[PDB]
């Protein structure tokens with residue numbers, strides 16, 4: 001079966017050069033074009049395509065920013081990215097069928113164009129005070145540069161929001177709708193060893 | 204190049220039928236492919252030449268002659284609830300247009316405001332939290348520190364698996380020096396014929 | 405009580421459509437499947453191969469079944485024609501028709517192509533048997549066969565003209581691929597192909613009812629009851645003959661060279677010579693050149709010897725086929741080379757039939773007991789020609805798939821432009837060289853011994 005495998009996530013700093021590999025198994029790489037695609041949590045763009053036995057085509061937007069190479073001794077297609085700033089996205093690699101012009105198989109790699117790596121700060125936001133039915137608590141995680149996994153001790157009613165960019169760091173919120181409040185704590189974990197857990201008090 | 208437009212970014216379906224429409228800036232000669240993409244997964248091929256399946260369950264059909272193409276799912280289940288893109292392969296510069304399906308539910312928003320904690324106030328900052336955990340559709344959040352403010356960060360999840368409701372987190376970052384403007388109010392405007400205002404002083 | 409001229413003309417008019425389609429299909433079906441049906445070249449290759457192989461398989465089986473058909477008040481061949489034509493004129497129109505099916509265009513095209521070839525065989529093979537049943541006179545049968553041949557050739561010209569001037573005139577969009585990167589539509593082209601299919605089907609029905617009107621059966625009852633039924637033993641005995649097998653292999657390899665040429669030539673002219681709207685005119689130039697060259701090659705065969713005629717005829721196209729893959733797509737050069745190619749087609753098809761009576765006389769001298777001597781020859785030739793042409797077309801289109809053919813491409817990649825130049829100048833050249841070597845190995849040496857065999861024909 002045809003399958004392409006891509007490299008792991010990369011975190012370049014500002015305008016560094018990032019190389020993404022795409023290995024291909026199950027078909028001769030020299031017979032079919034390899035296309036690269038761009039997805040910044042939105043619709044898809046087409047950067048470029050490379051034929052493993054000759055010419056390489058680029059879209060005019062990515063001319064000078066992207067560089068495509070193909071090693072046919074290992075069937076690996078490499079995409080080199082130069083200047084950055086808004087290129088933090090998902091770069092997909094997929095082989096074009098040599099008959100029509102569409103893409104049967106797809107891969108996918110992640111690129112985060114940011115700077116810095118700091119420990120998150122946890123704040124257990126609570127209700128200032130009111131009485132209406134069940135209560136809703138909160139937990140704010142601010143100031144990090146990785147992917148966390150906020151959890152709660154055995155309670156499944158939680159909503160953990162997608163993280164948003166603030167400055168050069170990431171901010172995340174979590175909400176819990178609890179009926180009774182004997183004791184609750186917010187536990188989070190950082191990409192790095194960084195990880196703590198803070199209880200939620202009143203007022 | 205060539206533009207491919209999907210007019211409805213979000214569509215509502217209830218396990219019955221869904222019809223996703225793709226429009227073209229040029230007559231492409233029925234040279235349109237359709238891709239399925241779940242979140243966290245790469246796009247996978249569903250239809251090529253706008254009428255031919257590629258190893259897919261028979262509920263995914265597609266039609267369209269020129270300048271208006273359609274994909275129909277007459278058996279839409281939980282695997283069918285994902286995003287779908289439309290590609291044209293008439294020109295050299297390929298293009299897409301994205302579109303997503305959503306379930307059908309009721310309405311009714313909820314809101315809660317939360318002041319910054321003392322630990323955050325100690326470390327030179329103040330983030331006011333507005334939570335909108337369960338609502339259906341699209342909503343707008345306004346901050347009133349006795350005046351409108353436009354320096355807040357907003358985030359929205361996808362759709363809940365069980366409750367089938369959207370959420371929204373609004374974080375208003377204000378320094379301790381600028382932390383005396385009076386009172387703080389979060390106002391939520393939805394299709395409910397009235398805003399929900401929650402305030403603290 | 406001889407055959408009327410009008411009856412023979414009606415017979416020939418009814419026989420024309422057979423090859424006509426066998427031409428229209430052999431000239432345009434590959435282009436239709438690759439560019440109008442929008443199939444993968446793998447599926448187009450398997451459709452062509454399985455369709456032609458099914459035609460080759462069904463030809464002797466239909467012949468054997470019709471040989472077992474009893475006598476009716478309507479005839480022994482007229483019921484087969486009258487009950488094969490209405491299904492065939494639907495299957496042919498259902499070939500040139502792109503289905504609105506979500507999956508399985510290959511199954512549709514395979515079923516309807518194989519059904520059309522089966523029904524065309526059920527039309528043609530009883531019609532081929534009909535020449536011994538129209539009259540008991542050898543001269544009348546020979547005149548009817550000559551009229552059939554002349555109409556058959558004019559019908560090939562007419563059918564190529566009709567298909568070229570219906571589907572080659574309508575402009576169509578292209579698909580600019582990445583390599584190309586630096587008012588009608590596809591539905592109009594599909595409508596044009598459906599119009600051509602309907603016109604050829606109407607001509608088929610008209611000639612079928614003309615054949616029904618102008619031809620009777622006269623209660624022949626298969627003439628003399630004694631006849632040979634040893635199909636395999638007779639074929640082995642015929643192939644054991646020297647000159648017979650030599651003519652079989654030479655004629656075959658030559659017909660393979662000129663049948664692999666056409667299906668790849670449509671693509672080659674449309675994608676290597678810049679003739680997106682002009683390949684129809686090139687095909688009509690080829691057919692007109694063949695029609696002009698047929699009396700010229702008759703005169704050449706009567707004037708400069710039989711063997712030298714087949715030497716200079718089938719090998720005439722080799723420098724032109726070398727030249728067309730070696731020039732930057734000149735219009736006048738391609739037109740003149742198409743004229744020469746039509747001349748060579750006329751030679752390659754006319755001359756073996758001219759050489760056939762000498763081989764038949766030599767076989768009659770060597771074997772005094774002979775029944776159905778040609779009847780096995782043309783058969784074996786038709787079966788092997790059809791099977792080899794099917795295998796050739798399938799392998800060529802699969803080679804196009806492996807080269808990376810682009811469906812409705814504006815500019816093909818370099819592998820495809822090399823493969824189309826090879827498939828019109830290397831494999832036909834190799835097969836023509838093989839046929840020339842076999843014709844060199846042909847031992848009768850034209851009439852130089854054959855007339856002496858004719859003297860032995862005076863002895864018996």
Ligand SMILES: CC/C=C/C/C=C/C/C=C/CCCCCCCC(=O)OC[C@@H](O)COP(=O)(O)OCC[N+](C)(C)C
Pocket residue numbers: 423427430532535549553556557662663665666669690741742745746749753754757778779782
């Ligand atoms: C660069 C140019 C590229 C060019 C393409 C070459 C093209 C020609 C395409 C041609 C059509 C293929 C022709 C195949 C049919 C051949 C048979 C034929 O067309 O030959 C006429 C006539 O000579 C035969 O008489 P027939 O065999 O039909 O009857 C005998 C019956 N019986 C046995 C009872 C006595």
Ligand SMILES: CCCCCCCCCCCCO[C@@H]1O[C@H](CO)[C@@H](O[C@H]2O[C@H](CO)[C@@H](O)[C@H](O)[C@H]2O)[C@H](O)[C@H]1O
Pocket residue numbers: 030031052053054796799800803806807818819822823826827831
């Ligand atoms: C019945 C008769 C059938 C005859 C069919 C004969 C066709 C055989 C040719 C196959 C088509 C491909 O022809 C091809 O041309 C190119 C020339 O640049 C070369 O191709 C070479 O480079 C290309 C990359 O561009 C790759 O496909 C591969 O690395 C290699 O094959 C080879 O020479 C040949 O693989």
Ligand SMILES: CCCCCCCCCCCCO[C@@H]1O[C@H](CO)[C@@H](O[C@H]2O[C@H](CO)[C@@H](O)[C@H](O)[C@H]2O)[C@H](O)[C@H]1O
Pocket residue numbers: 097099104257444446449450453798799802
């Ligand atoms: C004379 C013909 C000789 C044929 C004998 C050999 C037949 C077996 C060879 C198979 C080699 C690869 O065969 C190929 O397999 C794949 C996987 O199912 C099929 O599917 C392929 O086509 C579809 C549509 O174009 C695409 O999704 C993609 O190109 C690929 O999946 C093809 O239809 C078939 O051409």
Ligand SMILES: CCCCCCCCCCCCO[C@@H]1O[C@H](CO)[C@@H](O[C@H]2O[C@H](CO)[C@@H](O)[C@H](O)[C@H]2O)[C@H](O)[C@H]1O
Pocket residue numbers: 258450454507508509510511514
């Ligand atoms: C007479 C010569 C026969 C030569 C056969 C050589 C292969 C010809 C093409 C075969 C593949 C295309 O034809 C295909 O066949 C089978 C059923 O028959 C079906 O194939 C389909 O079956 C089911 C759908 O119910 C799917 O799970 C399967 O993935 C898919 O392949 C399709 O309906 C049809 O598109």
Ligand SMILES: CCCCCCCCCCCCO[C@@H]1O[C@H](CO)[C@@H](O[C@H]2O[C@H](CO)[C@@H](O)[C@H](O)[C@H]2O)[C@H](O)[C@H]1O
Pocket residue numbers: 413550551554555
């Ligand atoms: C649509 C209707 C078509 C028009 C009517 C039917 C055709 C009428 C006759 C065509 C004109 C002459 O036709 C052509 O004459 C010459 C005579 O030398 C024949 O040439 C041959 O005639 C006989 C055998 O038939 C032999 O002596 C010899 O093999 C050769 O001379 C051709 O086989 C024939 O095709």
Ligand SMILES: CCCCCCCCCCCCO[C@@H]1O[C@H](CO)[C@@H](O[C@H]2O[C@H](CO)[C@@H](O)[C@H](O)[C@H]2O)[C@H](O)[C@H]1O
Pocket residue numbers: 565569572573681682685688735
């Ligand atoms: C057999 C009897 C006669 C049958 C022919 C009937 C008339 C055919 C003319 C229409 C054919 C299709 O339309 C055709 O499109 C192509 C466009 O590349 C052009 O084709 C023409 O271009 C130029 C015009 O002098 C010439 O090189 C040449 O006559 C031909 O190639 C013409 O515009 C047109 O002749």
Ligand SMILES: CCCCCCCCCCCCO[C@@H]1O[C@H](CO)[C@@H](O[C@H]2O[C@H](CO)[C@@H](O)[C@H](O)[C@H]2O)[C@H](O)[C@H]1O
Pocket residue numbers: 565566569570574588591592593595596599603
């Ligand atoms: C020298 C031999 C001469 C043989 C050639 C002459 C016989 C055939 C007559 C020419 C007919 C040409 O066919 C022409 O094709 C175009 C298709 O684009 C048709 O145009 C229309 O066809 C049908 C009409 O219902 C529509 O579905 C189609 O949408 C539209 O394009 C023209 O109506 C037709 O006139």
Ligand SMILES: CCCCCCCCCCCCO[C@@H]1O[C@H](CO)[C@@H](O[C@H]2O[C@H](CO)[C@@H](O)[C@H](O)[C@H]2O)[C@H](O)[C@H]1O
Pocket residue numbers: 504591594595598599602603
């Ligand atoms: C103009 C010259 C006349 C020459 C003689 C006529 C030959 C046959 C030409 C008919 C062309 C038919 O053209 C075609 O018709 C119908 C509607 O009209 C449509 O065809 C569509 O409807 C039929 C209805 O059974 C379905 O098979 C299918 O949904 C689709 O093919 C196409 O849009 C059009 O391409």
Ligand SMILES: CCCCCCCCCCCCO[C@@H]1O[C@H](CO)[C@@H](O[C@H]2O[C@H](CO)[C@@H](O)[C@H](O)[C@H]2O)[C@H](O)[C@H]1O
Pocket residue numbers: 546549550553554557558695698699756757758760761764778
């Ligand atoms: C008008 C322009 C269009 C011209 C199209 C072509 C016209 C017809 C060309 C005639 C060529 C005849 O070519 C040859 O003639 C002889 C008879 O003379 C026949 O050859 C055979 O016919 C009969 C029946 O089998 C037997 O007598 C014997 O087996 C042999 O003579 C064949 O017909 C053919 O092998």
Ligand code: NA
Pocket residue numbers: 423
């Ligand atoms: Na014939």
